[PDB]
Amino acid sequence: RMVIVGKISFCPKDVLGHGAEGTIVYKGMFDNRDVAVKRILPECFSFADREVQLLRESDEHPNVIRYFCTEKDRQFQYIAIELCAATLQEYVEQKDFAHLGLEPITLLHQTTSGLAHLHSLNIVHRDLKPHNILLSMPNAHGRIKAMISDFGLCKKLAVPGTEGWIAPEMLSPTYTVDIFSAGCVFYYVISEGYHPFGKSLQRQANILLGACNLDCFHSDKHEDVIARELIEKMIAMDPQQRPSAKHVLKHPFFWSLEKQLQFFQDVSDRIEKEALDGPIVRQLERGGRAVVKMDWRENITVPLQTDLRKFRTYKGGSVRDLLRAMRNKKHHYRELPVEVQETLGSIPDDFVRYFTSRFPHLLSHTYQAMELCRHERLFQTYYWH
Amino acid sequence: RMVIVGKISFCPKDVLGHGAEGTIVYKGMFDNRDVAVKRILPECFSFADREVQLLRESDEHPNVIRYFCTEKDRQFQYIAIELCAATLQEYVEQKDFAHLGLEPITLLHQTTSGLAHLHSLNIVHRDLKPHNILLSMPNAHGRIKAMISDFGLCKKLVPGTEGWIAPEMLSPTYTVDIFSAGCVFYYVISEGYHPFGKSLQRQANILLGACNLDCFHSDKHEDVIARELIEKMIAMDPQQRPSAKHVLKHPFFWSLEKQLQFFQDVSDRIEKEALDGPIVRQLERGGRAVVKMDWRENITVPLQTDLRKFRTYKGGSVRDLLRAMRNKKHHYRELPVEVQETLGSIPDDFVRYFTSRFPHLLSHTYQAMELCRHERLFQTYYWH
Numbered sequence A: 001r002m003v004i005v006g007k008i009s010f011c012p013k014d015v016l017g018h019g020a021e022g023t024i025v026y027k028g029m030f031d032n033r034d035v036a037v038k039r040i041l042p043e044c045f046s047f048a049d050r051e052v053q054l055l056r057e058s059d060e061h062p063n064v065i066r067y068f069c070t071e072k073d074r075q076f077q078y079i080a081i082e083l084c085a086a087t088l089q090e091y092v093e094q095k096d097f098a099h100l101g102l103e104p105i106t107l108l109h110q111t112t113s114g115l116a117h118l119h120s121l122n123i124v125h126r127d128l129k130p131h132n133i134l135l136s137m138p139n140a141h142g143r144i145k146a147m148i149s150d151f152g153l154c155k156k157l158a159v160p161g162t163e164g165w166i167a168p169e170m171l172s173p174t175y176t177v178d179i180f181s182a183g184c185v186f187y188y189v190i191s192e193g194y195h196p197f198g199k200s201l202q203r204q205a206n207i208l209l210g211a212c213n214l215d216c217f218h219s220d221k222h223e224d225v226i227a228r229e230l231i232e233k234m235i236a237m238d239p240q241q242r243p244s245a246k247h248v249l250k251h252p253f254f255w256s257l258e259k260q261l262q263f264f265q266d267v268s269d270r271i272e273k274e275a276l277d278g279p280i281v282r283q284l285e286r287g288g289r290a291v292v293k294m295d296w297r298e299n300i301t302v303p304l305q306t307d308l309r310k311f312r313t314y315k316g317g318s319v320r321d322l323l324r325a326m327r328n329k330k331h332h333y334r335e336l337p338v339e340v341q342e343t344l345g346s347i348p349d350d351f352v353r354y355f356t357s358r359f360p361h362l363l364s365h366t367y368q369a370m371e372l373c374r375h376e377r378l379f380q381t382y383y384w385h
Numbered sequence B: 001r002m003v004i005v006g007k008i009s010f011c012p013k014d015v016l017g018h019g020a021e022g023t024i025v026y027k028g029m030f031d032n033r034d035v036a037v038k039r040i041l042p043e044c045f046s047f048a049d050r051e052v053q054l055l056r057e058s059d060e061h062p063n064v065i066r067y068f069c070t071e072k073d074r075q076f077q078y079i080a081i082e083l084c085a086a087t088l089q090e091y092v093e094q095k096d097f098a099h100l101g102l103e104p105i106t107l108l109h110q111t112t113s114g115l116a117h118l119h120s121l122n123i124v125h126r127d128l129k130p131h132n133i134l135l136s137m138p139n140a141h142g143r144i145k146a147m148i149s150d151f152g153l154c155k156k157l158v159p160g161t162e163g164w165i166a167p168e169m170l171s172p173t174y175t176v177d178i179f180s181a182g183c184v185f186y187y188v189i190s191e192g193y194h195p196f197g198k199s200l201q202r203q204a205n206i207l208l209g210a211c212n213l214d215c216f217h218s219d220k221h222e223d224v225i226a227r228e229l230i231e232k233m234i235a236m237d238p239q240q241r242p243s244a245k246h247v248l249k250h251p252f253f254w255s256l257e258k259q260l261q262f263f264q265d266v267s268d269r270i271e272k273e274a275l276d277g278p279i280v281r282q283l284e285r286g287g288r289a290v291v292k293m294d295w296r297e298n299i300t301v302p303l304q305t306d307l308r309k310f311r312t313y314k315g316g317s318v319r320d321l322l323r324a325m326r327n328k329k330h331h332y333r334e335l336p337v338e339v340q341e342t343l344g345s346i347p348d349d350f351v352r353y354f355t356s357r358f359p360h361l362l363s364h365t366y367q368a369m370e371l372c373r374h375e376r377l378f379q380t381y382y383w384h
């Protein structure tokens, strides 16, 4: 029993799912492609054709879903969007929805990026949640991407946003409300379903209080330490403490294994031929013993320790020495004995995961102390301005 | 066993059809649309990006297909276009083809409007033919539409396809397309035949100037007009061929309502004009033949029974047959029910009532009333 008003056509029996306050979404058509069509009560939700036009007239960013065309029926409003396979909540809640085929952290880099694109054109999303981060259907080689949908519309005194993800200062807007929401979603994904506030019913309450958890992050894992450090600044109750949408992208939390290793070698070079009295070297072993674990020669594999002893030249209490030794072994890698090669290798992946596995706080620390040289030529890929 | 060449993609098993010079067409993908992919050997066919980009840069005509995007393989070229349900070939020939919601004359009209659009952008097709006029798939409310494709491509290894090639290109401008068009016109209308007219001898006889048009009776109106236009379209002198938009203004396309309206406007215009007048004189030039000696004797008994009371009606004079037309149509409401039922309902059955009996009436009037071409009333009827 089809309908037209098109432009967009559809059938009312192909219901994708109900939205907020009347708004419902069915599966319709357009050119001759399958499309998701969303009917909204003009009395409830206010489209901003202005923003969306700034989006169209601007260059396509592949992580912000596209609005095909808009139609204003006499009593309604109708919108057409890319029939995505699922929202983030599907991806997160049934691991086997068949990603297959799409990494969590890259999903987060995409989401955060599309968001950076939105914040670029001075448009704020104001309702970021897993239900508004949709995953497309398999591409040409069967890859899947992440796009932010349902951005640009709002409510007209029927508080913007959705209970559970509403930045706290918006209860009592700029980009920070979107950053906060995003932080909650990073935690939603990484932790495979939990929320930092954390159960549905007391969620918005605890947000307004300041109650977090992040109990998923052990403090003995490199990965978890970095994730925690980022999310904390993301969901900071003082909205000024919240990272810029792009600042988030630049953070360690995303870095390739190659990137991390490179960072260790680059630090090891830049702090070389630099005296101990200097600011950098002084600051770098400020935490000293703690990150190195007293003697770092003592925490590693036997072959490595054996080889190292023959040079030392190597402290064991100095982070700087662990970095110099890392850089060194990476440099002379091919001409190293087979024993060590097997204990360390491959490269960069297993080589850098070797040292961060055994010094969870190494990267975190080095990166913190090396903040001094943020403006330098080499360190631009690592830090923000 | 999928292929790639991003962003297009297709399973090679899902073939749609083979083409000229090794060119092949498959069913594949683009965004997430099903889409037809046409791979060409870049050594045989040259794509004209400039033209197509000009098509994109202009407003979309609904009977002109859309080239989505092009990509070059290292050894090939790929081109993606709207998947269509058939070619005009099928439309015409497969007995149980649902040409649903689409009369033939409106198909040729859509086609010729698309051509007007393309000529308007100074882009010439060069290979118009049944395989290059495609049928869409049922839209929102089911309606089927036709569009032209494979334009903007050419051949490098003579343009055109054997059987639809203008003669003088052998011995290019828009005239070639008008000609080939004329051919497909007859083809569609004749329900399968060709003006020239058998596959092997087609091109040959076109060179020779041999036509056919045998499906065109001289006692049925439709045939007479279709003929009237096709003949001009498939002339051997490319200077005779009417412009793509000119072909549109032609009678062949008019709804019966328009036809009847033309007879009325003509009847009105001619009234109060001297019978020696060059226009009246011209209108009656063909005379006798078209009114069938005494047009009063060539109409239903009730109508002549009712016409006998007035005349005033010469009976050998198109001016009077046309005036009776206008006058009965006007005073229709008051006319006896007998006459009402031999005639009605207006416009369709009524204008049919006259064109049926006087097949040439319309053709003839149209030709003779070309003298008032420029007048403001007669712009909907004629080409300025």
Ligand SMILES: Nc1ncnc2c1ncn2[C@@H]1O[C@H](COP(=O)(O)OP(=O)(O)O)[C@@H](O)[C@H]1O
Binding pocket: A016, A017, A018, A019, A020, A023, A024, A025, A036, A038, A081, A082, A083, A084, A085, A086, A087, A131, A132, A134, A149, A150
């Ligand atoms: N662009 C889309 N493509 C496919 N499904 C969609 C799309 N947008 C929304 N949906 C589906 O419709 C449901 C309701 O969406 P919406 O009405 O915007 O409320 P929500 O805030 O939950 O997204 C969602 O669960 C989602 O599955």
Ligand SMILES: Nc1ncnc2c1ncn2[C@@H]1O[C@H](COP(=O)(O)OP(=O)(O)O)[C@@H](O)[C@H]1O
Binding pocket: B016, B017, B018, B019, B020, B023, B024, B025, B036, B038, B081, B082, B083, B084, B085, B086, B087, B131, B132, B134, B149, B150, B161
């Ligand atoms: N858009 C399309 N959709 C479906 N089939 C098509 C399409 N375009 C072309 N074809 C099929 O491919 C065949 C060959 O097309 P092509 O290689 O362009 O040569 P030609 O057009 O001269 O026949 C046609 O006869 C037609 O059946």
Ligand SMILES: *Cc1cc(-c2ccc3c(c2)OCCN3C)cc(OC)c1O
Binding pocket: A311, A324, A325, A328, A329, A332, A335
């Ligand atoms: C671990 C390590 C190894 C070397 C090193 C120096 C010189 C040579 C070498 C390895 O192998 C091939 C050729 N060659 C003479 C040097 C180091 O200190 C800079 C360290 O730490």
Ligand SMILES: [Mg+2]
Binding pocket: A019, A131, A132, A150
């Ligand atoms: Mg939504």
Ligand SMILES: [Mg+2]
Binding pocket: B131, B132, B149, B150
């Ligand atoms: Mg074709």
